Structure formats: structure tokens, C-alpha cells
Design a protein around this ligand. Structure first.
Ligand SMILES: [Ca+2]
Lengths: 428, 429, 430, 428
């Protein structure tokens, strides 16, 4: 520390403002802060979960779920940046981010457990208040039973530097006959791909039914916050004449709710002694994803034209599908997740979220006319200092989740120099 | 500056030759320069536009458009590297590049130049007129106005990110096939760009019967492509009317409004009542089909009926989104920064001369690799820090992406004041 | 060199253990070593080829092929890491790797030599893979070694092809339930895909007389590379003047040994209508587990038959379209790219060619292991990367090879690594 | 640089005058400069090509070709030294050379592309204005789209030192009955040899023709500016009686034009069941070569004494030829070539060439009576300095082809000491 190092200051105290990442990604950019402010209402059980995406390169900060009588979560709302970055910028990179979670009202209130998990949302094996505590072995990535009144601070720590600029989901110039037409340029670099072999000569056998017989061929945990696509093909064989197949893909939210439902093939006759192809050509736009996607499943309906008492409908199925979630493997886009769980909070009280997110940004064409961009400030040793700090993360006690009181202490313990500027004022 | 720093020299004075980028991308490579030389002819209006892709990792340097009586641009030709890199190399990275635009011959001084570097791809520019260019950036060192054509302009490529991966060039891959016109390449793929177009969300179509059908343009959207791309996704059609037949075509439109590529996506396609009718998109567009930069995509649909009469009212509902993936499209330099050089008031028939040097890190193809030694880059510490410092002070140093050539020449000699032979190595021991 | 530099030590002497790569990719990770041990049996010809993927970010180390009487190679087995990384970890980055190849046992035989090269391309890109032909795959003298005695053996050392690489997703199983026992769901290496584009036809005219059973053609064949999952997309469009033509089409993915690895019917029994486009879409996804050996080429066959049929019937169609073969994470440096070939010949039939290696990784544990596996940011030492850059910059004058006569590598180890100095007065400090 | 180094000065600024090459070739010699001055006229297409032989040890500097409507070149003239060195000197060595090409009149004018190619003229795969640019990979051996008004400077850079003295094509004392008798002593050291196996049991078969049937047995690219010879033998076998063979060798110029035509065997009966020899004993003197030779071809005429409708004439041929071009492999004699191409220059305008060539020379016997010769000035470190400079050629930007403006700048940037001579004038 001398004066200090703008980047370290920004990284460890994001509410302080942005600084350019001192890596090798030399783009002309501009630096911005976006606040997040939410007043969430506590449900009947007095318990709930905030899912944060600490590294998300853009306006999505997290999602809030209330816990219900029956032990299920129920989606409340997305937690966003104050304004929608893709409306003004085309490219983006996360510099630093911190969020504060505490109670503000009562109609004192319970406790908080928090973890930073090194995987995407659907990968967590246990998301209960208590179960959170073992999502990492890292002591500085979990905090237990912090009083809600005092609150918790979530600090975003890096998962890789020299990251590319991410395209935001920015609207692209387009005209179309449909009012509800939407055209964007999506986060794409570093896609995540899931491959699901749904069937390898899977035999299906069942008696006839008016209305048909529905099965769930598979269900698989995947993650998506933004646009994705499904490709691939199932091949069906049969000895039985006049079978008609229906198939639907469901994308399921964290709360078990159907987020998206897409008929992949409806009313589709099967021919005897031939391959019957069922292609998958799904594109799911960002705006359709009303809450984080947590799993994908495929249902198949089998029915017969004629039909009787005992008819026995049978088919064989083979094939694999590929689920590409665009930009999904970009560190921060899905990957690190910070869960903040609260319980025993009085029903009707307010859980207050306040955060600052800092970005390197490239303006969209209209803003670029009035927004000057520059290469980052050069200070050598900024990156080495960051590397040193992170290297000593555990001995320094630099947490991703803090009791706010402890984070406040840390701020003043660190940051003991901010020294005006000695004789520039008297120099010459 | 001590002696100097090969990379800085190469970056600021590309005509000087190549140097390895001093980042962390440690590959065994070889360093090469490729010249670009063009003598472009000025059209009737005395006005035109050169689109440069200053950061393009490969042989595509830009494109020339003439401006026409009716105010439209008309494509002239691609501006390329002297030789086709993908014929000899498989992987590539741009080190540095500069280009010069000026007039040489006058027919039996000519006008002015405006230039900008725009931080987006070609189709993203809101205004591409000679005058309108000047506001594409707010950055004073990324625009230059009313430079005399005789003196000319210098385009200097400034970085948009280091630690970039090697890009696969569009290199031919060994292949045999029954078709003479068969082409197999391995394309720039890393860092794709993806556009998502929701063309319809229960869009109702309604119209009276027509012999030959009724054609509509469902959507049109600005996209960018110079190299291979693909279109995926699906539209779903519903209808109450029997015997409707659908035709659908995708058009990829050039900067000059011209159709570059036209692909029937579904021709003659009967719609069944009370069911989803699927129209999949499985398009792959190879690089060699893209004769000029793609600027927009549109989809037309033809609706016709088997029978047909006077008043028949054909109706359908449509739902679905498409995804346009342009391979390696988000790789910084591949589409992103664009430098426009516009000229006007140049006498018709005069020559606008382009001369450039492009510098590359390259990996040879298998046949060349047998005779082309590759190495890790020369190590000099502080090269990257010095680059970072220079760029950090870009504006106070006045390091432009577009220069009046005279000012760039001055800068060269102002900078580069040491190139000092090599003092007593010659007398050492 | 002072003490030394853990990373350089790991890079140049991988059997020594792992160290964090001193680049800018700051992830909380853990460091691990995985051994590779194989005892390969020499075939009838006394000759064979080991294909190594020195930079592979994961458990695939290489593949062994024996050479046969007829001059063809025949796949033996994949060479892997001791345990399957994707079963325990989700993300991975290669730190360093070295492998040893030597004779250990013989029947009865005093012959046997190794030629080896590191080729800066993927397997299918090599123009000549014969024992002798290897020697010209690079011009780099420190990337080839010739006629090393098999008894002494060869050392393959993995040298970097780029730092600041992203973590690669391993082919890790993803939680899934399904009606099929043989159901498999993974999250694959995807970042940095490789894409091949094949224009299979541009108004290609087909013409042939009728045949019971049909007339099969190979429309195209193209060299591609795949070790892990890939997909095929695109479309062919067929036109015809002849009524009642039925088309069959199959894609074959062919192994290095000319053997069919994967065969997928793309369209079987498919009637063509007169005066219209007839679409043949490609919607293929090939999962990793189906790829039993490295894929070296792709070909498409088309069968043309007619419902009726007679003596002279002349079946004709026109075809247009291109396909795209995406191999997931294929362009990630190391995934396909550098290949080291170790060829042996004149080894006595029935003798053992022994492979021993160590691979070092930066790893992120899967959710179950993450509960008990502490992860950290890498040890900071400044000048580690500069020192690496210096070393590599002077690679040729230092004689740092990717393929060594083992005896020469051993000498190099002791020539380098002349300081490992205990730790002077910490023991007496205060 | 101290004062400077005469040789480096001469090498980098040839217009400055000659200096002795500081190698080990210690001959008593004399130093001379010869200018080259040409005013070339631009043809109909406004386009043309100047071929320079930058290293030529003697009076041949280059050749000018105009480009024609049909895309062919047409030879204009040889570009020579001001006076014919072989008339006055017997031996010679090139020290340094520079030439300038620019427009001097109009009847504003076009552009120049230039390259130095490390091979002889006929070896260039592409000689078009645009194609030139890829003849080398060396950035300092090519220059693109230089304005003709400003012009280009060609600088000759070494291709080997410790070269022998070359015999010029000097006239030798001789008397003869023929007025047109010419006797010279030619550049011979380091011959270049081409070997052409024209036939290895090549079967010829064709129907009879009054006047015969002519074939071109082979055509091969070779290079010659000065004297050459053709040796070797073809052997013909046949089953057919009364066949008569004619054979002619053509040496073809760069412009596709026949430079030299020599009947090798005219009217030559073939005997059945025997080898029929056709020897090659050609000597081509320098003075017959009116423009650079670019290829050699051999035509054979086959005719029959009798002759009818269908007669079928057949022969088998075997043998190889050797083309020796005297002194051809002497570095500079054929080897490096610098091409200066211009286009878009107005028809009728003058392209002006001005150059200086510097030589080490040994006078002919008559001049030797009045021309003092000496061993070169000794300065140690001259050669090391040259080696250093050339070793750093690319970082110093020492080009073989320059935009003249850039070369002029270089001259004044270099050559910053030429310091009179401080107190010799005041010494003692
Ligand atoms: Ca870096």
C-alpha cells in the first residue's frame, strides 16, 4: 500500500467505485457503477433464500426465493442492476461487486447462513438453510448464523482475470411484422454444452389409452439465466402401425415451476420398419427465461389412431441431445454462486438488499457518440499486488461472505491510507 | 525507449515489420508481414467509402464501396492481403497493421477524406455518410476530418485486447468428394457471436388468396458476417384453413442493399389444421459464398392455397425464434472495430491508392510446417508494461487510429529517435 | 534460479509434482498429479505408433496403434490417466506433463528403435505417419528425435501452447434420471469450439441406372479431428425430374486406423418430390462415450433407390448444401492440437513397450468433493512467468526438447536443478 | 561510426562513389563509378516493368519491358552502364549500386510496386504488378504503391563477399577473314548448369505430312544474359525406313519472343535397327543475346522421303542435354533480381532511371599502361561493421527497394558525421 492501488480498493471495497482490471485485456472502455436496491418481503415461514451471481458480467445480480410451508421454494423476483445495461452498452466485464443483506423493518429477526459455491445453481446438492454450510470446504467462503439485523456482506472475488468482454443481451436494429419481435446479440463466447443421451435403444411398451400414454424420458439438471438452444435428434423404431408421437421439452425453474414449455413434435406418425426422426431445433431467447433454469425434461406422448382394449403400443428410441447455453462457461455467467439464506425472520418484515457493481463497458452505437472511451490507467504492480493479496487470502481473512460488522472493521483496518495529496499544492 | 522495444516499434510503425506480442499466449509461431496494394477507381459521384477491419486476424483487410447517383453504395471489391494466408497457415494472430489511403493518378488536387474508427461492427453504424462518420465515436483520436486526398490518410490499428487466442484461418482441409465444387475448411470458430431473433410470438397473418401467393417479409435484422455462419431454430405455424402451402426464404443482404446469399428454408410445405407445423432452420453458410460483408438478414414467407378463388382469406399463426451464429464473430478484430475512410469530391476516373502492411503471428499448415521453423517469442520484460503505459497515455501522446498521413510521418520521426546501430559489440573482445 | 521456481520445476520435470501456472487466470483451485502406466504388447510386425496428446486438459493421454502386415494401423487402446478426472472434478487446466516410453520385457532380440515428433496440428492433419515419415512433420530440431534405442527409451515433455487458458469443463456426469439404464448426461468441454464447414455439393448432378437394393455413393470424405463430443449441423437440398426416388443417407466417423467408429443414419427411406426442394437436415450429436478411438475423418454415403424399377431407368438428382461439424472445445490449445507421435519398429514380437507418465493439473472439484476439498488461489511468486518466458525464449539454445532420448533428459534434469538446498537457517533463526 | 567507414558509405550510399570491399580478395585494382541514365517512354497501357540485376558484375544493369493490351510484355531495351566496361577492363567486381526510378514528364501519374527476388528472372512465378508483392517474404525487399512522381530507390545489398574477380566479356586480339568476327574472354568462373532429360524412350507416332510433322519435345525455363553453350545427345530408334529428322533449338526471351534460333540437325536420315545420334554442340556468344533469355525449347521435324495417305511415322528418342551458362552461378550474374513495376502512368510520359554503379576493376592491357593499380585501403573493423549492419538489417530498416523519400531521409539520418578533418590543419 502506497496511496493505495485503485484496483485493489475497488476489488475489496466495491462501494468505493470502479477501477480498470490490470490484466492484458487492453480495450478502450469506460468505467461505471450500478447500484442494486431491493426491499424483499418475508413470507409465511419467515425463511427464504437469495441466490447471488457475484461474477455475472451484466445486470443480473441474483434471485429471491421464499421458503414455503411444504418445504418448497417459490420464486419471488430477479435482483437486478438499477438500470438495464444492455440498453446502453454492448460489451461488458465485471470489475468488482459487493452486496449487503439485512433486515430493515418489523411488523431482532432471526439469522443468516451464507456460502459461495464454486458451481452453478443446479449443481448444489443441498440448498437448505443448514445444508448450505457444507457447499465448500473453504472457511472464508461460508458464514453461519449471522444476526439478520446486523446483516451479511457478499464480496465478489475473482474467478479468473484476462476474461474477454462479454456481449450484453443488447437489442439489435430490426424491423418485423410482429409487435412482440425481439432481436438481440447475446453473450456467446465460451458456451456451456450439456450432452444428454436420452436413449440407447430404449424399449417402450404400454397398453392403449384414449388421450395417450405420457412418459418422462429423462430429466437433467442444467443451468441457464440467458439464451440457450437445444439440438440433436431422437430416432424411433416400431412394429406397430398407426402410432402417433407427441413430445415436449420443459425447462424447470429452481422452484420446480415450469419456466418454458416447447412442443418439439406434436402429432407425428411412426412408420413400421424405418427410422422415424425427431429433430430438436430449439432456440430459447433470454426474455422468455423469467427465472433461473435448473433442469430440463422431455415428455413423450404415445397414442394410436384406431385403439381398443388391449393394444400394446411399443417403440424403440435412440439418440442424444445437446443443450448449448450461450456464454454459459464464461466465468461469472453461471459459475460461482453465493447463497444467502435467512430463517426465523418475522413474517412481513423487510429484508433489504443494497449493492454496488462495477464494470468495464463499451457503449452501444448511439451512446458511443457521446461517451469517450480509453485504455485503462497504467499502474505496474497492481496485478502483482492483487495476486499477492489473493495468494494470502486465507491468512488475511478475505471472505466472499462476511458478517457486515466484520467487513466494516476490515475496511477501516485495510484502507489506512487515503492521504489527500501532499505538496502538489506547494510544489512550484 | 532504450534501443527501442521491437513490439512498440511494430505496433506504432507496422511498415517496419512484425514482432511477437508480449502477452501470455506462449505458442511456437513464426512472424510475417503481408502487404496490401490496391488501385481503386473513383466512380461517377467522385465519392466512396473504404471499410477497413483493422484488427482482422487474417487476410481480409477491408472492402471498397462507391457512392452512386441515387445515394446508395455499390460494392466494388474486397481488399485483401497480398496472398491468401489460409492457403499456407492454419492459425493466426494480428500483431499490428497500418494502411495508407491517397490519390495517385488524376484523369485527362481531388477532394477530401473523412475517417473514423468505430468500436462496433459494420452494420451497427447508424450513419455512414461522408459527414455522418464524424460522430461515430466521441474519441478525438479516432476521427479525422477533411484531410486532402492528395496528402492522404493513415489508418493505424490499435489493440482491442491482448492475450487473444490464435484464430484458425479458413484453411482448406484434406477432402475428396464427387463434386468438383466441393470445399472443406476449418473455420474461425473460437468466440462465436450469436444473434437471437424472435421472429414471431403468435403473429397472426391474414390475407386474401392470390395466384402465385402472398409474400411477406416477417422480419429483417442487422447482423454482421464476413466469414462462415449458421442459422438454427424453428418457426411453428398454426391454422384453421385447409390446404395452405408455405414457402420461406432467407436472404443475407450486403452493405450495399444487395442480396449476397439467398437460401430457401422451406419451399412447398403443406399446413395441417389444428396442429403445430414445424419449420426448422438448418442453414450453414460457407465463407466462400460471402462475396461481400453481410449487413442484415431477412426472412420472407410465401403463402398460397391449392384450390383458390375470389375471396378466400388465408390465415396462419406463427411462433418461434432463430439463432444466427457467426463463427469466431466475437473474436476482437474479426468484426468488431471498423475503420471507415470516406472520400468525396475526387475527380471521376482518378485512382485512390491503398497501401498497407499487416503483421502476424502464424502457425504453418502441415505441408509448410515441414520447412518452417517455429519458436516461442523473443523475451523482453517491460515490453508489455511499456505498451500499457503508451496506450494509457494514448490521448496525451496523440496516438491516433486515423491520421493525416503528413502528421503520422512527423510522429514516426518524433518517436523513433533511437535506432543506434550497435555500439561496441564491434570492439568488445 | 534461486532455490528454484516451483512452476519451472514442474514444467521441466513433471514427475516432480504440480505447481500453479503463474498466469492471470486467478481461480480458486487445487493441484493434482495423475500417473499413466501402460504395458503395451508389440504385434506381429514388431512395429507400432503411440499418439500422445501432450496438452490434453483431462484424462486422455494418448492412443496406441500396432502396425500390421498390410501396412495399416490397428487401434489397440486409449492411454489414460490412472483415474477418470471427470468423475471427481468439473474443471481442469494442464500444468505440465511428461511420459516415458521404453522396452521392459522380451520373448526369444537386440533390435528396436523409436522415432518421435511433436507436430503442431491435430492427428488427422499429419501428411505422413510412417516411422520414417514422422521425422519431417516439423522443421524444429528440438521437436523430433530419431532412432533412439527402445531399451533406453524416449521421454515426451509437454511444452506450452499458450498460457492464460480458461479452465476446461471435463466431461463430468451431471445429475439426471431417465427411463433408460444406458442414459448418460454430461457437461462437456465446450469453450473454444472447432468448426469444420463442408460444402458437400453445389448443384452436384447424380446419374445412374436402377438397381434392386439401390446405388450407393460416397458424396464426400473429409479429414477432421475428434476425441470428445461433437455435432453435425446443416442441410442438403435435393432436386429431381424422376418420380418415386427414395434416398438413404448415413454419416460415418472413421478412426485413425480406417475403422468405422460411429455410424449414424441421417435419413433412411426418404421420398423425393418432383420440381421441389427436398430437404435433408443434419441434426447429429455424438456423445464422448461413443468415441472409442480418435476420429480422423467423416464421410457421407447416399443410397438412391426407386419404388418401381426396371432394366434401364436412369435415376438422377441434383444436390446442394453445406454441413458444419462442431467439435466441442476442439480449438482449446491442447485438446486436439499439439500431437506427439512415438513410433517404434524392429521390436521383437511379444515384447512389452512400457509407458509411464505424470500429468499435473489445476482442478476444481465436483460438488460432492468440493465439500471436503479446500481450494485456493495459486501461490504468488513474481518473476515466475518472466522466467518461464525467458526459458522458452531460449528454448533452442538451452536444448529444451518436447521429445528426448531418455538418457539425455536425465542428464538435463541433473544439469538443470542444481539447487534444492534444504532451507538454511530457518532452523537457527530465532 | 567514426568519421565513417568508406565501404559502408559506398554500400549504403552508392551515389557517393566507390570503396574497396574489405574482404580477403586482395588484388591490385582500381576503383570506378559508372552512371546509368535512361529516359524510358511509357506505352499504351501506361504500365511496364523494369528488371534490374542489382549485383551484376559489369555493365548490364537491367532491362525494360512495356506491358501490352493483350497482357504480354514487350522488350524495349537493355539498361546499361554509361560506357562499356569490357572495352577498357578485363576483370571486375561489384562494390555497390543504387538506382532511382521516377517520372520526369507528362504529355499525377501512376504507382510503383517493387521487389528483390532471390532468384533469376525466369524463376519468378508471378511477374504482374500485383503479383510481385509476394516474390519474397522479406518486408524490406518489397515496396508497394509508391507514387511514380516521388519514385523508388533500388539499393543493391550483398549476396556474398569474398567473390572472385569476374572476367568481363572483353574483346581478345584476333584476326579473321570475316568482318563480323568476334572473339571475347567470358565470365566463366562459377558456371550454372541445367540438365534436361528431354526423352527416356519417348515414343513418337504420327501420320505422314508433306512438309512434315513438327513437335516441341520440351520447353524449360533457364536464365542467360551472357554466353552459354548446349551439350549432350539425343538418340533415335525406328522401324520405319526413310525418315528424315530436323531439329532446332530456340532460346526465348522474357517477352515470349525468339531471341536465338539454332538448327541443331537439319535433314538427317534415320537408319532402321540402330542408334541414330543427334549431338548438341551449340555455343551462343554474348552479342547474340539481344535480351535476357528466359526459356529454351527444342522442336523436331519428322518427314519421309516417299510419302502417301496413311504412312504412320514413328521413332523412339532417348537422351539428356546440358545447358551451361558461363559464370551463371556467380552471385549477382543472374541471381538476385529487382523488379520495378509501374502502372497507371499516362501514355507518352517519361520514366527516368538514374543510377551509380561502383566497381573494383583490373584494366585491359592497353589501359594498364597508364592506369596505376593498388591493393585496397586497409581499415580493420570495416568488414565487422558491415557484418553488424547487415546482421541488424531489418531493425535498421535497410531496404533493397525504397520509396525515394524514405531513402533520402535514411541518408541524412545515417551519415551524420562527415567532419572536415579537425587539427591536421593546426597540428605542427
Ligand atoms: Ca495475461
Amino acid at each position: 500500500t502506497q496511496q493505495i492501488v485503485p484496483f485493489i480498493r475497488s476489488l475489496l471495497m466495491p462501494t468505493t467505485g470502479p477501477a480498470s482490471i490490470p490484466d492484458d485485456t487492453l480495450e478502450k472502455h469506460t468505467l461505471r457503477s450500478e447500484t442494486s436496491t431491493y426491499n424483499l418481503t418475508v413470507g409465511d415461514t419467515g425463511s427464504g433464500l437469495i441466490v447471488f451471481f457475484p461474477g455475472f458480467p451484466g445486470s443480473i445480480v441474483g434471485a429471491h426465493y421464499t421458503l414455503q410451508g411444504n418445504g418448497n421454494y417459490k420464486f419471488d423476483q430477479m435482483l437486478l442492476t438499477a438500470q438495464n445495461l444492455p440498453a446502453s452498452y454492448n460489451y461488458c466485464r465485471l470489475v468488482s461487486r459487493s452486496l449487503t443483506v439485512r433486515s430493515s423493518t418489523l411488523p431482532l429477526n432471526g439469522t443468516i447462513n451464507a456460502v459461495t459455491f464454486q458451481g452453478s445453481l443446479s449443481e448444489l446438492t443441498d440448498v437448505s438453510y443448514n445444508g448450505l454450510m457444507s457447499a465448500t470446504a473453504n472457511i472464508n467462503d461460508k458464514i453461519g448464523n449471522v444476526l439478520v439485523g446486523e446483516g451479511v456482506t457478499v464480496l465478489s472475488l475473482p474467478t479468473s482475470y484476462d476474461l474477454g468482454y462479454v456481449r450484453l443481451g443488447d437489442p439489435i436494429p430490426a424491423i418485423g411484422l410482429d409487435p412482440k419481435m425481439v432481436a438481440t446479440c447475446d453473450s456467446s463466447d465460451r458456451p456451456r454444452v450439456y450432452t444428454i443421451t436420452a436413449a440407447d435403444d430404449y424399449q417402450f411398451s404400454s397398453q392403449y389409452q384414449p388421450g395417450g400414454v405420457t412418459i418422462t424420458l429423462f430429466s437433467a439438471n442444467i443451468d441457464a439465466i440467458t439464451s440457450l438452444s437445444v439440438g440433436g435428434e431422437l430416432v424411433f423404431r416400431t412394429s406397430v402401425h398407426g402410432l402417433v408421437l407427441g413430445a415436449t421439452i420443459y425447462l424447470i425453474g429452481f422452484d420446480g415451476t415450469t419456466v418454458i414449455t416447447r412442443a418439439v413434435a406434436a402429432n407425428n406418425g411412426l412408420t413400421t420398419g424405418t427410422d422415424n426422426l425427431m429433430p430438436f431445433n430449439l432456440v430459447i431467447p433470454t426474455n422468455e427465461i423469467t427465472q433461473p433454469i435448473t433442469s430440463i425434461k422431455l415428455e413423450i406422448v404415445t397414442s394410436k389412431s384406431g385403439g381398443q382394449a388391449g393394444d400394446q403400443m411399443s417403440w424403440s428410441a435412440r439418440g442424444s441431445l445437446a443443450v448449448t447455453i450461450h456464454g454459459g462457461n464464461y466465468p461469472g455467467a453461471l459459475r460461482p454462486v453465493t447463497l444467502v439464506a435467512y430463517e426465523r425472520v418475522a413474517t412481513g418484515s423487510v429484508v433489504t438488499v443494497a449493492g454496488v457493481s462495477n464494470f468495464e463497458l463499451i457503449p452501444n452505437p448511439e451512446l458511443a457518440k457521446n461517451l469517450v472511451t480509453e485504455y485503462g490507467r497504467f499502474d505496474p504492480g497492481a496485478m502483482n499486488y492483487t495476486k499477492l493479496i489473493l495468494s494470502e487470502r486465507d491468512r488475511l481473512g478475505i471472505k466472499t461472505v462476511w458478517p457486515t460488522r466484520e467487513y466494516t472493521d476490515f475496511r477501516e483496518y485495510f484502507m489506512e491510507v487515503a492521504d489527500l495529496n501532499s505538496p502538489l499544492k506547494i510544489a512550484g
